[PDB]
Amino acid sequence: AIRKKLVIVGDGACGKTCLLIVFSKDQFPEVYVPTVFENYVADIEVDGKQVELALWDTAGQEDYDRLRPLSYPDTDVILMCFSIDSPDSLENIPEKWTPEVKHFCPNVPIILVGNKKDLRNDEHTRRELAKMKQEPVKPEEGRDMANRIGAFGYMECSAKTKDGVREVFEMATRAALQ
């Protein structure tokens, strides 16, 4: 098995910690959802190739511009997250997260991931967003941002229901192998 490293980046409320927890346990915890994620080394077999994929979170580092880049050395694939219930988290992608990841991880594939896709058809989410003249992120808005920033690809998932979670990490493993 070859060793690859994955780092997840994005705003504080983007759901990156929950995404790593659900994938590493293969379950949305029924009793207690952890506040933080330390690290994990996933055994993944994608398209016949065995990989040990080390997983890292940047949660807690958002306000610390000199500590945060220490998470980037030798990264093989970046998951750049935004929350579908937060159009504001998508607007921070092109001119905050994107130039940072391109500077510290040149030539590293970036997969733009729209998290919490289950909230796109949640009435409480639609009501709350409508108060600020907003709506949940549309699939084409996510694809267009991914196209614009030079992302390897665009994907959506729900850590709550596990839908799309396995596919994101299998695709990230394939990107890391290229």
Partner: protein, 245 residues
């Protein structure tokens, strides 16, 4: 880690660690508060364990089995003894607070009502100055440690055999040399996340809500100071590159 502490923190949560007949006696808000306090102590126990792997398995193993040039082991594991001292003392305080709170006749049933004061003490005065000085030095030497590791693994046969030997067991899967260094660097930025969530469930006693709000402020001040004191060291960097920063 020692077996006693491992067993006390083996469950995924405080609600699964205590007896179900003890859990049933508490309100939902107390269970939510205790589950996050348990996570803080459990992750601190794991972080002290990461520092023991760095000091006893890697550092001491290299000094006792390998013939590395002087100052090479220090470059791979900067400040590890100082870091181990700070966190082992902090862990001792957290575990003693839990131990004092146990019900008579029980080694697992407890409720920690007064964490705030312990966190204010840890994140103020001399212990805070020592944490700021140590992480500013460690985090500025992080990139240098990783590059020194990569050079040694690629060019030194006995070093590569040593690494492959001591990292082969399944319990070391997440704890290679580079993984330990990043786990330590990321530890300090986990504290505000854990403290804010404990605070969210600590409104029942106003003194406790105030103490946790003060501790949260102190941790953030510490992080801002460490962040402002970092400049990555680079082996062979010239003075001209440094003063033209």
């Amino acid at each position: 880690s020692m077996e006693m502490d491992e067993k006390d923190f083996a469950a995924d949560s405080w609600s699964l660690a205590v007896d179900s007949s003890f859990l049933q006696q508490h309100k939902k808000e107390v269970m939510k508060q205790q589950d996050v306090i348990y996570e803080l102590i459990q992750t601190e126990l794991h972080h002290v364990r990461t520092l023991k792997i760095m000091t006893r398995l890697f550092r001491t193993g290299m000094l006792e089995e390998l013939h590395l040039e002087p100052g090479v082991v220090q470059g791979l594991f900067p400040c590890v003894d100082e870091l181990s001292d700070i966190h082992t003392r902090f862990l001792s305080q957290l575990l003693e607070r839990r131990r004092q709170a146990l019900c008579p006749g029980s080694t697992r049933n407890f409720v920690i009502h007064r964490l705030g004061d312990l966190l204010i003490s840890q994140f103020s005065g001399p212990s805070a100055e020592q944490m700021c000085k140590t992480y500013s030095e460690f985090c500025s030497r992080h990139s240098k440690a990783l590059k020194l590791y990569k050079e040694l693994y690629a060019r030194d046969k006995r070093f590569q055999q040593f690494i492959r030997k001591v990292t082969r067991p399944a319990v070391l899967k997440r704890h290679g040399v580079q993984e330990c260094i990043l786990l330590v660097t990321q530890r300090i930025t986990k504290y505000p996340l854990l403290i804010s969530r404990i605070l969210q469930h600590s409104h029942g006693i106003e003194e406790e809500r105030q103490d946790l709000t003060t501790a949260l402020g102190l941790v953030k001040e510490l992080l801002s100071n460490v962040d402002e004191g970092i400049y990555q060291l680079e082996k062979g960097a010239r003075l001209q590159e440094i003063y033209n920063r």
